[PDB]
Amino acid sequence: CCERVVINISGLRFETQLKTLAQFPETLLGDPKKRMRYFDPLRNEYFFDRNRPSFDAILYYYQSGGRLRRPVNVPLDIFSEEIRFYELGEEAMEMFREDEGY
Amino acid sequence: CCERVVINISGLRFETQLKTLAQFPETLLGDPKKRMRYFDPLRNEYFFDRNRPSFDAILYYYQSGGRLRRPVNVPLDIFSEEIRFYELGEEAMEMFREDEGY
Amino acid sequence: CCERVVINISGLRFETQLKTLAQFPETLLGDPKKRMRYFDPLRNEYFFDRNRPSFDAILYYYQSGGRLRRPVNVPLDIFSEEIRFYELGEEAMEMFREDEGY
Amino acid sequence: CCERVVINISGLRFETQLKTLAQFPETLLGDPKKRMRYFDPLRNEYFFDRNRPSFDAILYYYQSGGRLRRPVNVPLDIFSEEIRFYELGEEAMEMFREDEGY
Amino acid sequence: QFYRNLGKSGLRVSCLGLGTWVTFGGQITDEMAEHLMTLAYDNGINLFDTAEVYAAGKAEVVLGNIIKKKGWRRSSLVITTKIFWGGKAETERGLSRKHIIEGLKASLERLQLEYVDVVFANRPDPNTPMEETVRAMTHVINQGMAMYWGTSRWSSMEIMEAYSVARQFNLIPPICEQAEYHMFQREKVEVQLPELFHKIGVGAMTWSPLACGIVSGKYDSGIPPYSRASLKGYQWLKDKILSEEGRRQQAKLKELQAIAERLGCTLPQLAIAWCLRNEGVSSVLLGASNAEQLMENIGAIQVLPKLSSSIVHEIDSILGNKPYS
Amino acid sequence: QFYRNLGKSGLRVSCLGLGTWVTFGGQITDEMAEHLMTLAYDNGINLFDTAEVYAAGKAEVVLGNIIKKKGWRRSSLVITTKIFWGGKAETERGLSRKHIIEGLKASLERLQLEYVDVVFANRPDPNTPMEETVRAMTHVINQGMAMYWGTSRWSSMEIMEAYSVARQFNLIPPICEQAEYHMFQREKVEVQLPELFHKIGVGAMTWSPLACGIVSGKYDSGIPPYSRASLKGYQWLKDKILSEEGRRQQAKLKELQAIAERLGCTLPQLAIAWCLRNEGVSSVLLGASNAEQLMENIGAIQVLPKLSSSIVHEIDSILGNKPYS
Amino acid sequence: QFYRNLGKSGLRVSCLGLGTWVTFGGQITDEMAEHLMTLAYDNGINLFDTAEVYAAGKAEVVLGNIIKKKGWRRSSLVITTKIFWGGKAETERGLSRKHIIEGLKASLERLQLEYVDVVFANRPDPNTPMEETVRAMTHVINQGMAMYWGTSRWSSMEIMEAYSVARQFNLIPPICEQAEYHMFQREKVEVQLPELFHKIGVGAMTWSPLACGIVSGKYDSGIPPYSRASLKGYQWLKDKILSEEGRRQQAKLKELQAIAERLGCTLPQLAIAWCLRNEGVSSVLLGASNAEQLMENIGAIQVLPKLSSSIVHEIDSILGNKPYS
Amino acid sequence: QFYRNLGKSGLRVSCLGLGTWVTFGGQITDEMAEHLMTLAYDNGINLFDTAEVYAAGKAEVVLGNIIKKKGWRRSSLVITTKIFWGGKAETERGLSRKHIIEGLKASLERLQLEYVDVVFANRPDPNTPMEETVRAMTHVINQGMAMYWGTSRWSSMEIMEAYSVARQFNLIPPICEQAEYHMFQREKVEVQLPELFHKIGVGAMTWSPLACGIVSGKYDSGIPPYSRASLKGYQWLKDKILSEEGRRQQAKLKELQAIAERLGCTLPQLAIAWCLRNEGVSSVLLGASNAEQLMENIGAIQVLPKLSSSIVHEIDSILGNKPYS
Ligand SMILES: NC(=O)c1ccc[n+]([C@@H]2O[C@H](COP(=O)([O-])OP(=O)(O)OC[C@H]3O[C@@H](n4cnc5c(N)ncnc54)[C@H](OP(=O)(O)O)[C@@H]3O)[C@@H](O)[C@H]2O)c1
Numbered sequence A, B, C, D: 001c002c003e004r005v006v007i008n009i010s011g012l013r014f015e016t017q018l019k020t021l022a023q024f025p026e027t028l029l030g031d032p033k034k035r036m037r038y039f040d041p042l043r044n045e046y047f048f049d050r051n052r053p054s055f056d057a058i059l060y061y062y063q064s065g066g067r068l069r070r071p072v073n074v075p076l077d078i079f080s081e082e083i084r085f086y087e088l089g090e091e092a093m094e095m096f097r098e099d100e101g102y
Numbered sequence E, F, G, H: 001q002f003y004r005n006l007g008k009s010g011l012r013v014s015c016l017g018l019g020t021w022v023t024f025g026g027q028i029t030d031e032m033a034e035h036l037m038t039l040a041y042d043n044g045i046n047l048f049d050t051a052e053v054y055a056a057g058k059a060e061v062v063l064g065n066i067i068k069k070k071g072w073r074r075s076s077l078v079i080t081t082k083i084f085w086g087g088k089a090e091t092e093r094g095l096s097r098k099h100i101i102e103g104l105k106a107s108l109e110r111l112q113l114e115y116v117d118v119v120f121a122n123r124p125d126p127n128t129p130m131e132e133t134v135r136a137m138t139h140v141i142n143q144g145m146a147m148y149w150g151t152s153r154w155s156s157m158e159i160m161e162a163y164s165v166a167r168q169f170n171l172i173p174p175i176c177e178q179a180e181y182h183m184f185q186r187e188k189v190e191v192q193l194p195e196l197f198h199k200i201g202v203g204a205m206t207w208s209p210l211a212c213g214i215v216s217g218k219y220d221s222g223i224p225p226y227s228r229a230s231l232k233g234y235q236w237l238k239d240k241i242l243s244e245e246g247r248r249q250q251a252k253l254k255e256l257q258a259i260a261e262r263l264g265c266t267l268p269q270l271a272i273a274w275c276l277r278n279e280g281v282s283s284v285l286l287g288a289s290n291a292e293q294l295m296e297n298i299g300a301i302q303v304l305p306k307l308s309s310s311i312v313h314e315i316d317s318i319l320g321n322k323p324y325s
């Protein structure tokens, strides 16, 4: 709820409440056992050495509640390998490709 | 005037003077009673767990004095639900749609 | 030279060496008497409550040595009112409009 | 291995693991003797007073393992002078121009 | 509940405090000063406010000898002090780093204490940066000379500036605010202070609930002998009562005699329980010159359940000075 | 190995600790208290836990006279204390900055020590910000009154809140956690605590391994004389044993008599080595009223190699209370 | 106004200060040193500058015995010291952490003080990082050995470097700057210093307003006996006066005799009120060897209303050395 | 330049230091220990390295009585200590916050010093976080027990980890590094340490330049009596000399006799000036058991201009162990 989780994507910091990420319990950011290995205890943050412009669409997936879409500057090969890492499911991947038309 | 207000939009920090936000007293960022519930006392900032690229056009609405326009990477369904949150009025919404053509 | 100057554009921080800004002594960022009124002594930085995406093209004007160009997401009315503030001259404004075609 | 290298590109932070940059030992960010002259010891970071949007494509070259591509807002004259600085080779430059079509 | 927090802080103070302004070290004797604190400490008051400017430092000496004589635990008391005026020299005034460290070290030798709890900046200093004040207040807390710090008579922009510097430099923000609040002074504690409390967590410790004795109603027949208006050097209080704005206030206090008669209370008990009627005011600093006045004013806690919403509406029609936000 | 780290910290404590609750300064004499610590310190125990609330502060006095007289190096001991209740005054309770600094300075004069190692917040304080607690705990560490600090009985959300304030303000995070862990209290140390240990590095120093003497099995024939349930002011323990939920637990302990007979051990030695069977629990605070009990409970270290996986599966079928994640 | 702030800081100093260089502990006796400070302190001067290098540390001893003998309040004085030279050993020079902490502690035992107000770095140290100097200056302020710190003879780039380390590491920036400023040395305080004052808030405390006695005009007929140029080890001042660049300066001082005759003043009073004519200079460190010189130089405050814009234009045509920005 | 900085720090140390390992408090008497330090301090050596593990703490006692007897200024000396081992207890080892604060406070009572210049972590601690070590080393510097801190035998990843914690938490980074460097141990100081010097500013204070006396050449005819290899408990040095890898080294030292004969020097003077031939090594810790050895080894500064580039090329062909980057 009130607790805010700082997620650091290669030096870019995103801060969101814990009850936003816990809306989707089977993803990598929703399951605390999965994201436990990315925690930086000296900085109190989750560090992902991953693609930087992909994560704003991954973050707004949790905030809007399931409305993800590809950013305009991120290609389809890069962004589809980010949905598989962040584990947004076999279900929200099919809604992604139909919007895409693939 | 001199006082600067730090507004944190999901980890992205925007700093502006207080006399910029107080130019428009009926919005969410202009009325101190409305934005009181978003204040983070420990960090001395206003935290909004909202859309990140929408707020640069919302911030430049206050700086330019009423000239808002949609960013090129933010769709019309996302950005119109941000003008309703930040409470920019029924008056600056109609000037937005005419530029838009809606 | 070695000294670095932190310029804060509405919460976005740009750090550059002092011998980069001092390459152009008649602009607002090159003349120390002009930029004296924007200095924040408690944070050791220059704070400009101005447009945010315009300044990356203004910063790379000093780094490249005179090669400025408009960013793709910043319109011509917004970006031309930033060249007049940062005082890049009557000479580098004419090289801007010819590239533009104005 | 777990050590993280913070790279500062004109005020924009780009934290990365050391075993990511050490994947390519002949570049400027892979050879510790080459990047030694850019280290800021008071801040524990590498400071480059260079172009800002070019480096996200340079950073994702090391993370993906050799897949670089030009960002959409960075022109071909600006971005090609960044590959020569970061010393990504005569070999990954030829793979860049063929994708480009040059 | 009689004990309440001071702001958002963990410091539990009583809802009535005792102040050493004028009466201690000045007006009344050392033996009566020993008797008033024993009467206050046995009624549950733990808040004892003094300053270095009071009686040229003699008010802290009287307070200091009572805690040693009575053998009170320092843990059970909340001793607060105020630091702005140290003496005649130019370096002995203000909120500079030199005077906050010297003036508090000088007050801790008159009080004979190892620490005070809340040190107050007694008024704002325009000739000092706010960084220097907040660093010097943080310094005397980390040295252990004080636990908390607060501000007295600082506008809410100066309190919000002080708070901002403490978050910038990882210093200690103030917890408290002393503001004048009685029936004839309502603008700061009802408008400005409430906003601060919900935002950053600063409470109010309001002083002079009877307006130096005016709202007690004793001055309706002129100036009685042996009251504060007849003391030496207090012509500003006699000019305040006898002026035409001060003669009008006594015409309102006779209208408040009827409301205090409808309750069981008196007019000093009404004027104190009116100050405690909100959750924003964290304490009230009394003033008492004898044992009948202090026993009367501690009886104002019983009047606080008697104030309904309707009596608060009735008093504000008599006062006619309710502030607008 | 008998010595193990406390959390991720460098503080090496023994796997069995001795507590001064009830016995020291209360139940047993000063001469038996001198004999139990010499028996514990000669068996390798360096962890000696006390509090200021125990015996109205008399338990720290007994511990304090034992370390002075024996002449035990302070370097070889790990002395821990707990600070929540100081006395009757309203300012003498809680985790405010006033009470953490005063209550630890008051405990260091009864213990006659220059510093304790770990100061514990004995319970959480809802009337205090977490910034004020973490700044006051950092203050007494930087003054040198304590080396480490921990929390007792805090929800893992309160521990994670106190951790995030220490990283925000560059303060010192807690290293430890005291939680009740025996065969009849498993929810916090097996579910909540393990998550904290791998994330931020907080270990558990579990207290009451025999549930105030219940799991020793002595209460199966009623209430024996001169045990803790028959002491004055401990009716809450007699109501716990004689109730129908407490009579059911004694029916489980007779089933544990057969498992303790299959090993060489007894039932107190089984109930302690069961608490040390995981890597998350960093220590166990014993309680002992005489020299036969303490010699028995230190014999539970050698029973810890005897516990296989199968006996752990066998006890949990008898207990029937294994928590689910 | 006679008292003015030191930079932007809250430290209120007088516009004339007294320095212990040469005269104290060296040239003049201890009894005359007691008489000059009583004459200065009774005229409102609170600024008394010394150093550890002066008279091999004997100048701080003389100053130290006067404050104890006169019984002056430490609160009313502003004592400043300089710490760059300690002795013959290699570890006794520089601005290292060893010498700042070690050096200041040695000066506080000769001055017999608990603290000085402003400790100055007497010259820059190329063999030390600026982090080590700013951390060591912050250390002696947080220990309470000093209130403020400043720098002497530092290039405005070195002052701006020391400022940017203090904001980086949350340390304490310097408040002051001692720079030589008389009629024949104008480049730093009129060009470099003003920029610093409006940017970061560093004031100037200028020393040698009479250029070691040259601008007093006493050296026009050669070298008078019992002046500073005839003292032992001051051949550098005799070589400065008698050289052809120094003989030209005396030809300008005869032209300044006519301007000092048009006013009521003398030439030392003119040369001091010329240094105070701007708002950037926060103080002027006098030097006086007897009571007639000090009474003369404190009479330069009266000449400061007499300087109009036109006399400032007239002197600068005689001097012919106005710097260009 | 006899005096050189220690890393980038402002601490000026001499190029030769005196160590108290084995000799002081062990091998040689207290009267010879007084004579060696007077011979060293009169030749300009200010660096005197000791540890708490040496002679079970008796080596610091001997050093402590010499500084009090000779009346040396503490300002002129650089005293360094090492804190890894304190005794037999489990809490008396490691780099925990408990042992760094206790072990340095225990060493300052044997040395009879107020403070020490550099405190050295004598070896790395795998059972302690680096945050706890850097916070405890920062703590004893801010309390004034030490000025600087360094590390001993820490790999360059552990030094770079300790540096990145100090910038993260605004702590104090180490300035120094003690690494073994002689003709038969070259890998750390020529490859790993030079990289760290130019990056973060850590210098090397190399110990054992003669490899516990091997490179002096005295062991070529077996084991001479009254040397270190024949002392009690030093069988590891006799096993090192008499082994087949240690017999091969003596065959190289006879080839170095010809190079030491071409210069005026001896083989101990050659083996020390070879260690000072680079700018990375900031000091060399000697060892001396009598006054002829120490007078011989201080004569190695004169041999340092005699080493050209060609003799450095000639020795490395004899040694045959030059590391590759
Ligand atoms: N700037 C600041 O922070 C500040 C400034 C002023 C005061 N304070 C604090 O507030 C306290 C003073 O409040 P105050 O004394 O000024 O106003 P009160 O309203 O606190 O004044 C009480 C005085 O008025 C008279 N009085 C009180 N109760 C009475 C009763 N029931 N019947 C008849 N007379 C009564 C008393 O006798 P007399 O009429 O004979 O005197 C008494 O001396 C001080 O102790 C001080 O610590 C703070």
Ligand SMILES: NC(=O)c1ccc[n+]([C@@H]2O[C@H](COP(=O)([O-])OP(=O)(O)OC[C@H]3O[C@@H](n4cnc5c(N)ncnc54)[C@H](OP(=O)(O)O)[C@@H]3O)[C@@H](O)[C@H]2O)c1
Binding pocket: F018, F019, F020, F021, F023, F049, F050, F082, F122, F152, F153, F178, F207, F208, F209, F210, F211, F212, F213, F214, F216, F218, F226, F227, F228, F229, F268, F285, F286, F287, F288, F289, F290, F292, F293, F296, F297
């Ligand atoms: N909030 C907190 O942090 C907290 C709260 C409570 C305790 N603690 C710590 O934990 C310690 C107490 O643990 P505890 O004493 O409550 O439970 P135990 O389970 O530690 O209780 C031991 C007590 O039960 C009886 N007993 C122990 N071993 C026995 C044996 N082998 N045979 C027969 N009887 C035996 C003893 O004699 P009797 O039956 O005659 O008494 C003894 O007094 C204290 O020292 C305290 O420091 C911490």
Ligand SMILES: NC(=O)c1ccc[n+]([C@@H]2O[C@H](COP(=O)([O-])OP(=O)(O)OC[C@H]3O[C@@H](n4cnc5c(N)ncnc54)[C@H](OP(=O)(O)O)[C@@H]3O)[C@@H](O)[C@H]2O)c1
Binding pocket: G018, G019, G020, G021, G023, G049, G050, G082, G122, G152, G153, G178, G207, G208, G209, G210, G211, G212, G213, G214, G216, G218, G226, G227, G228, G229, G268, G285, G286, G287, G288, G289, G290, G292, G293, G296, G297
């Ligand atoms: N690096 C630094 O920070 C630094 C360096 C130097 C000085 N200072 C400070 O500045 C102070 C010294 O200033 P200063 O003494 O060098 O130059 P002044 O210009 O301050 O020198 C005054 C000296 O010149 C002569 N003099 C002064 N007034 C006179 C008058 N009205 N008539 C005739 N002779 C007069 C005096 O007698 P005599 O001619 O007989 O001597 C006196 O000893 C020191 O106290 C020191 O604290 C600081």
Ligand SMILES: NC(=O)c1ccc[n+]([C@@H]2O[C@H](COP(=O)([O-])OP(=O)(O)OC[C@H]3O[C@@H](n4cnc5c(N)ncnc54)[C@H](OP(=O)(O)O)[C@@H]3O)[C@@H](O)[C@H]2O)c1
Binding pocket: H018, H019, H020, H021, H023, H049, H050, H082, H122, H152, H153, H178, H207, H208, H209, H210, H211, H212, H213, H214, H216, H218, H226, H227, H228, H229, H268, H269, H285, H286, H287, H288, H289, H292, H293, H296, H297
């Ligand atoms: N971990 C650490 O940080 C660490 C570890 C060890 C030492 N250290 C420091 O380094 C110092 C020790 O260096 P070291 O003593 O081990 O190696 P050296 O190379 O410093 O050893 C000198 C010893 O070898 C012999 N020797 C020296 N010069 C000689 C000469 N000219 N001719 C003949 N023999 C000579 C001496 O007599 P003998 O042969 O009769 O003994 C002497 O006792 C200690 O004082 C200690 O403080 C630090």
